Design a binder for this molecule. Structure first.
Ligand SMILES: CCCCCCCCCCCCCCCCCC(=O)OC[C@H](COP(=O)([O-])OCC[N+](C)(C)C)OC(=O)CCCCCCCCCCCCCCCCC
Ligand code: HEM
Lengths: 78, 101, 420, 446, 53, 55, 51, 292, 89
């Protein structure tokens, strides 16, 4: 009884992932499909931090403040 | 032999793609196997190949060639695309044999 | 004339198990201790791509040759993976299992892992993860393992979102070279003779024989994580640390889940022998589904309760289920209930091993765990050797231990661990 | 060693006996310590007359809620006590009540099954509770798109016949049927000559026959008015139902033609044809090297999310075709490629794909006949449909007699220039109408 | 080949006396031989000389 | 919005064929010749039309 | 053209011989009918009355 | 939400509040992903009708007289009801969220419950923040008087940045340590910062450092109210929180009234309190809460 | 910038004298130590490596370089990396 299918009865397909490299003769139950997941928006990349001198100040010290504007870009302070 | 090697260097100079800085495998016509082998290239060789092609097209556009010190010499013409092309050709022959039988 | 199981341990460590029952379709599997627990934070999701990379080009057969040759005889090649173990299984007619073993042993022993093939496979990795997380149970069990463990068993079965596009050929090669060694492998064949299995074993895998890379010991951390996602039903799993593989307390915990309730036996039934279902149904008239969860691995185990309920009534149902386990921790149980739980557990084991692929999975798991096949009658008598005091001890070990909680849904009325 | 032939012929035979009521008692013995014992009844939605369209389903709900001898949940307490599993299902033609248990619990299980077929007390409060349960499970069943599509295909293919109506029935009948309709359905369609007691696994046939004589003797055997029902053939109609709802993310389309039936042997050949086309979904690891040309072109052009082929058989009729799930902007292309494959099987079948389909069918049959539950299921369906259990050696003989010429002959008989039934659900505007599909059912070049 | 086409254009404007018949015959034979035979053989020789295969 | 050259259905054909058509930078004067042919064809048609007015 | 030299292509060609021959018969009959060819229509009995 | 979550410390602060509170402060500032496509107009109407009421608003004007502002107040702001909905008091839970996303830099925040707005002890917590480092004072400086930077920088040869995080709300508080470090050296940076705060909590501090922290706090306040936007934000926050305008001289006076024993008490409250941890990056070497 | 340099202090009014002499200590009596020169050379090299990934700075530097060719206005404030490697005291 040293197996996840023999010891975990109902929780057999959630503790185990079964893929097929080559499909068999019988089709599997619950074929399933991906219903066209949405695309995240494309944003410009931020500069990295490779020295201590530019990392200085990046740690937060104040509560989160969000700000939006009519013709001002949105900003966040820490 | 050595005479055939010297005549092959002479033919390499007479072909004239070394004057544009091109390699041997840059001048291959893009068939299906050649495009698959190009798509299987690493990105450094891919970028080098397309910069060489762009420079050759620019030189042909102004009807000029490279300086003679910048020509692709015969013994530094590395066949980078050749093993990928052999892999693509052999698997296409395998698929053709399976469809044939 | 069906004979018995027959075992040899080769000097390079490889276990060979065979049974010749003269079945028309014969099944040959190979079991490796190379689950997702053997990764670390630098190569997360490598086992998922390795599981999905079974039909890639090998040293001996291309992807086209493997796929068209397995489909030409109508055979089947599948990969099943847990957090500890991977199993590559082929099955087909007895007249084609020679080339089926050629294909399977080439896939196990000599992969190539070409970079364009894995670059094509990463989109399939994303698609497979989405299909797997289409249901709430998979996500809540992955979250439960991630919050329950620190390093080893906390690694997910499915690749994380950031790691897609970052898994390379070198990581797959390193994982195969460090975990696909002969001392961690068992080759198990139903419907095949011993001689052909042992000769293909000695002429394929004769190059790797070590113990491989040892994994870290799994460490419990506990805690809770909550996923507010606006589902109609609240899913909640509350577990604690339990026994491992190889102890009688694991048998006590299996008897404890079959006493508390481990799935319906009747289609659209009421579960009138499930203590958790009775304790919920005496107070709540809403639709619900309460069961006992047990997942034990070779160094550590998780035992607890699993609830699906309405969002408004998510609280007291969980409390009711928890209270029922506390009653079992106080000795409030009857011997007829424990006997019925033992009968349910042993019937579930026998129906799990009654099918051919379940039998092969059981033989492969036992050959990896101990190198010998334990007969089912001894499993029956070791289930029957469990006492009532062991069940009470397992229940009090669950209620005394610190908890791991994974919740998902509209969690406005879902309680916390300190409120229990 | 042993080849495929004597490995198939070493399978133990299914032995069938008959009681004085006409009740069939069939069993097949294996070495397993477990067993599956079921009752198969020739009663489905095809025997209902539109006034009791959900009687079999609602009786299937009520059958486990207590009998006269075992009132209420005490009954299911008994099937918990031995740790057995209790299942039931209903199709358009057959109803099954089956128990998976141990071998040593063989008598009581049979006794339990006896109560389930002839002593079910239908309480009115339980009738109201199961009515609400059936309403809510139809309310979740219409979310599953393939069940909706196959019900639509059955309705539009068997218009005006009792084969169009679903197993569950309409919601108005669920709100309308009372206990007396259930009693009349139970006294009409649960006759002993239309019943098979099937057992698979660790059972002895003589002990099972003695238990059937003890418990299952004298069920009805008499229709009580000399009013015997008769099975009526169903007219197939080439037609189309299009349920357009553009808010759904994916579209499900099923296209079928008329099948031959249970007793017509070319079904086997048609199964080989289905094995040439095969099935596919998006989680398959084969890539572009799949042997099926439809699956290969679907992977290559990113057309479908899934497809499957079906050969559904009823008493001298059936539906033979394909169901695919895909997004809207691919649908027409999928239809085109699917029809091309059918015409290729009508015109240009070669020996290699026929050999591949025969191997796939052999693997499918033997791998399906594995475990006590599918063996008992096959015994029940074989005694209900064929009147006998066809052994695997006869199946292998009928498979090996199939060649390419008779496959393209039978495919031209059943697929070429036939009017199909089309059922679509989802964003199905680019799904072609009936003239384009009907024109795709033949080639101008033959 | 272009030179041979020029020769054929010259011969087409000449009457049929010596040696215009044999010049036109050799010109047409060389035209069809250059297009149909000599150019693919030359391309194969070039592929050998460039070490392609 | 006002990019009529790529939104007008007539004008986008002339745009796609003669204005925003991606052409190789290095093509010699030989690649002129086919365009000359089209212009020469137009010339023939025009002259022929006036030659059709009195023949 | 050694790509199409195999048993499967020979079986496909053998299967498509009678359809191609029937189409060639269709083309020959249509050519004779459209051109009103006297080498054939003088032999068909009912067609002889129009000459 | 994507533009705001482009940088990691926003997500760290969101996960930290979700760790720290059960309700009424753990609600995110940005909309969750499932709630997009589902927020309706009647929900917005309900929120405005229950929270945009007259007893919870302050109209503040710079550059206008009182008469114009009060007449548009009586002509607009008289049609609303009263105090509106109450709230849910923001009870504390604690815990940990670790978000493995394989960044080159590990961001960690370890916080505990502190004083609320209006408590005097919160002022001491502010002083404690400037005892530990609330940001640089020199463009490309070494942070010589920052105790956390001095304690971490002696054992690190690779880039880091450590500061003290302070967040006071009308019923609750959150004081802790923010660290940004490499993946391989997150544990020693976190342990060095935690040991520095533990050493502060054991009475190991200088009065000159407390005076420098007070000067930093006073200069930060007077530079925050320097612009007109910061001035009007301060006036509106004071009018909403206390219903009165407190002069900056009185603010500096109650800053100077803080004792150093109050700073020791605040550090001891942080040390003995139940912790809350939010971490992200390559967390193979980031320690857990029980491992500290 | 390309034309101006600024050293500025924000302080309280009462600290106004000391701040001024701090400025008089910065632009007049700076001590340029050699190990500090090596440390800031490495810091500036990796800070230019950081600035390489900000696309608007790269684009505006490219705009200056192509708009003011052959003039001192084309070059950046940071300069090329080789000059950073070989500037002496
Ligand atoms: C104008 C009226 C005809 C329009 C086309 C048409 O319906 O064609 C019938 C059909 C197509 O219409 P269809 O859709 O009715 O085709 C049904 C085809 N069967 C019966 C095989 C299922 O066209 C043909 O069959 C080919 C017609 C030409 C035959 C060859 C040339 C004959 C004369 C040679 C000289
Ligand atoms: C549709 C447009 C055209 C029309 C209406 C047209 C009409 C005529 C007419 C009326 C003539 C007789 C007048 C003459 O002898 O010069 C002529 C002559 C001729 N055309 Fe065209 N033509 C057209 C296009 C072309 C084209 C495209 C060609 C080929 C390039 C062509 C080649 C000739 C030649 C070779 C002559 C004989 C010239 C001569 O010997 O005088 N024509 N055409």
């Amino acid at each position: 009884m040293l197996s996840v299918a023999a010891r975990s009865g109902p929780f057999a397909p959630v503790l185990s992932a079964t893929s097929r490299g080559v499909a068999g003769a019988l089709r599997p139950l619950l074929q399933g499909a991906v219903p066209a997941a949405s695309e995240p928006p494309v944003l410009d990349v931020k500069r990295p931090f490779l020295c201590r001198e530019s990392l200085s100040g990046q740690a937060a010290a104040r509560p989160l403040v969000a700000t939006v504007g009519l013709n001002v870009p949105a900003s966040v302070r820490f | 032999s050595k005479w055939l090697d010297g005549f092959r260097k002479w033919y390499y100079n007479a072909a004239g793609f070394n004057k544009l800085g091109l390699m041997r495998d840059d001048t291959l016509h893009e068939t299906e196997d050649v495009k698959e082998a190009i798509r299987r290239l690493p990105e450094d060789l891919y970028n080098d190949r397309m910069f060489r092609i762009k420079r050759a097209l620019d030189l042909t556009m102004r009807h000029q060639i490279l300086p003679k010190d910048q020509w692709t010499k015969y013994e530094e013409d590395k066949f980078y695309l050749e093993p990928y092309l052999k892999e693509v050709i052999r698997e296409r022959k395998e698929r053709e044999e399976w469809a044939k039988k | 004339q069906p004979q018995d199981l027959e075992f040899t341990k080769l000097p390079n460590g490889l276990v060979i198990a065979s049974l010749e029952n003269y079945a028309p379709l014969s099944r040959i599997g190979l079991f490796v201790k190379a689950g997702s627990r053997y990764e670390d934070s630098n190569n997360l999701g490598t086992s998922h791509l390795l599981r999905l990379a079974s039909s890639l080009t090998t040293k001996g057969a291309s992807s086209f040759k493997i796929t068209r040759g397995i489909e030409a005889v109508g055979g089947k090649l599948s990969v099943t993976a847990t957090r500890e173990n991977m199993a590559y299984t082929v099955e087909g007619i007895r007249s084609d299992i020679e080339i089926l073993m050629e294909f399977l042993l080439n896939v196990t022993t000599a992969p190539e892992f070409r970079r364009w093939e894995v670059a094509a496979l990463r989109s399939q990795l994303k698609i497979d993860k989405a299909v797997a997380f289409q249901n709430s149970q998979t996500r809540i069990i992955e979250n439960l393992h991630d919050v329950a463990y620190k390093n080893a068993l906390a690694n997910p079965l499915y690749c994380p979102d950031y790691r897609m596009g970052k898994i390379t050929s070198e990581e797959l090669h390193y994982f195969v070279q460090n975990h696909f060694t002969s001392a961690r492998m068992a080759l198990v064949g139903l419907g095949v003779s011993h001689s052909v299995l042992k000769q293909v074993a000695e002429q394929f895998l004769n190059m790797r024989g070590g113990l491989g890379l040892a994994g870290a010991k799994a460490k419990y951390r506990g805690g809770e994580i909550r996923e507010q996602n606006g589902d109609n039903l609240v899913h909640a799993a509350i577990v604690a640390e339990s026994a491992a593989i190889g102890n009688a307390e694991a048998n006590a915990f299996s008897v404890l889940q079959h006493l508390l309730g481990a799935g319906p036996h009747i289609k659209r039934g009421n579960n009138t022998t499930s203590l958790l279902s009775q304790s919920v149904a005496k107070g709540s008239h809403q639709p619900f589904d309460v069961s006992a969860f047990n997942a034990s691995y070779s160094d550590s185990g998780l035992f607890g309760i699993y609830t699906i309920s309405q969002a408004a009534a998510a609280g007291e149902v969980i409390n009711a289920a928890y209270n029922q386990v506390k009653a079992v921790a106080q000795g409030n149980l009857s011997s007829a209930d424990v006997q019925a739980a033992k009968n349910k557990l042993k019937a579930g084991y026998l129906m799990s091993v009654e099918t051919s692929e379940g039998f092969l999975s059981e033989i492969g798991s036992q050959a990896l765990a101990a190198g010998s096949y334990m007969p089912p009658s001894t499993v029956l008598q070791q289930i029957d050797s469990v006492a009532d005091a062991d069940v009470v001890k397992a229940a009090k070990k669950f209620v005394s231990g610190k908890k791991s909680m994974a919740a998902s849904g509209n969690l406005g009325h879902t309680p916390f661990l300190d409120e229990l | 060693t042993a080849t495929f032939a004597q490995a198939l012929q070493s399978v133990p035979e299914t032995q069938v006996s008959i009681l004085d009521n006409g009740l069939r008692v069939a069993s097949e013995q294996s070495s397993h310590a477990t067993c599956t014992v079921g009752v198969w009844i020739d009663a489905g939605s095809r025997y209902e007359t539109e006034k009791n369209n959900g009687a079999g389903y609602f009786l299937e709900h009520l059958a486990f809620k207590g009998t006269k001898n075992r009132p209420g949940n005490a009954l299911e307490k008994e099937v918990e006590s031995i740790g057995a599993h209790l299942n039931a299902y209903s199709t358009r033609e057959h109803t099954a009540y089956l128990i998976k248990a141990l071998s040593k619990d063989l008598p009581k299980v049979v006794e339990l099954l006896a109560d389930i077929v002839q002593n079910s007390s239908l309480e009115d409060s339980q009738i109201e509770k199961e009515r609400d349960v059936i309403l809510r499970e139809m309310q979740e069943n219409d979310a599953s798109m393939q069940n909706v599509v196959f019900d639509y295909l059955h309705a539009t293919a068997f218009q005006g016949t009792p084969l169009a109506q679903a197993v569950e029935g309409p919601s108005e009948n669920v709100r309308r049927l009372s206990r007396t309709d259930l009693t009349d359905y139970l006294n009409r369609h649960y006759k002993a000559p239309r019943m098979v007691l099937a057992a698979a696994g660790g059972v002895e046939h003589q002990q099972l026959l003695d238990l059937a004589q003890k418990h299952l003797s004298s069920v009805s055997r008499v229709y009580e008015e000399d009013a015997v029902p008769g099975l009526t053939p169903c007219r197939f109609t080439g037609s189309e139902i299009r349920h357009r709802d553009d808010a759904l993310p994916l579209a499900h389309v099923a296209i079928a033609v008329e099948g031959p039936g249970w007793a017509n042997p070319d079904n086997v050949t048609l199964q080989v044809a289905n094995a040439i086309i095969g099935h596919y979904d998006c989680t398959y690891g084969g890539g572009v090297h799949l042997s099926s040309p439809l699956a290969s072109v679907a992977v290559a052009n990113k057309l479908c999310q899934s497809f499957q082929t079906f050969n559904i058989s009823y008493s001298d009729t059936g539906l033979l075709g394909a169901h695919f799930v895909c997004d809207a902007m691919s649908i027409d292309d999928m239809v085109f490629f699917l029809q091309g494959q059918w015409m290729r099987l009508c015109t240009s079948a070669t020996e290699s794909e026929v050999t591949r389909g025969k191997n796939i069918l052999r693997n499918a049959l033997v791998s399906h006949l594995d475990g006590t539950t599918p063996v008992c299921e096959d015994i029940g369906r074989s005694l209900l449909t064929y009147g006998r259990r066809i052994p695997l050696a006869e199946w292998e003989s009928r498979i090996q007699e199939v060649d390419a010429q008779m496959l393209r002959d039978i495919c031209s008989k059943y697929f070429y220039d036939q009017c199909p039934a089309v059922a679509g659900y989802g964003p199905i505007e680019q799904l072609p109408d009936y003239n384009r599909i009907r024109s795709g059912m033949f080639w101008l070049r033959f | 080949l272009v030179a041979n086409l020029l020769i054929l254009t010259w011969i087409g404007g000449q009457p049929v006396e010596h040696p215009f018949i044999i010049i036109g015959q050799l010109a047409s034979i060389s035209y069809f031989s250059i297009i149909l035979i000599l150019m693919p053989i030359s391309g194969i020789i070039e592929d050998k000389m460039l070490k392609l295969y | 919005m006002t990019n009529m050259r790529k939104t007008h259905p007539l004008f986008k054909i002339i745009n796609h064929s003669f204005i925003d058509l991606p052409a190789p930078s290095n093509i010699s004067s030989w690649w002129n010749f086919g365009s000359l042919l089209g212009v020469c064809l137009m010339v023939q048609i025009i002259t022929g039309l006036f030659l059709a007015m009195h023949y | 053209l050694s790509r199409f030299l195999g048993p499967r292509y020979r079986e496909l060609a053998r299967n498509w011989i009678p359809t191609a021959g029937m189409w060639g018969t269709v083309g020959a009959v249509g050519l004779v009918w459209a051109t009103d060819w006297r080498l054939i229509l003088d032999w068909v009995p009912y067609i002889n009355g129009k000459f």
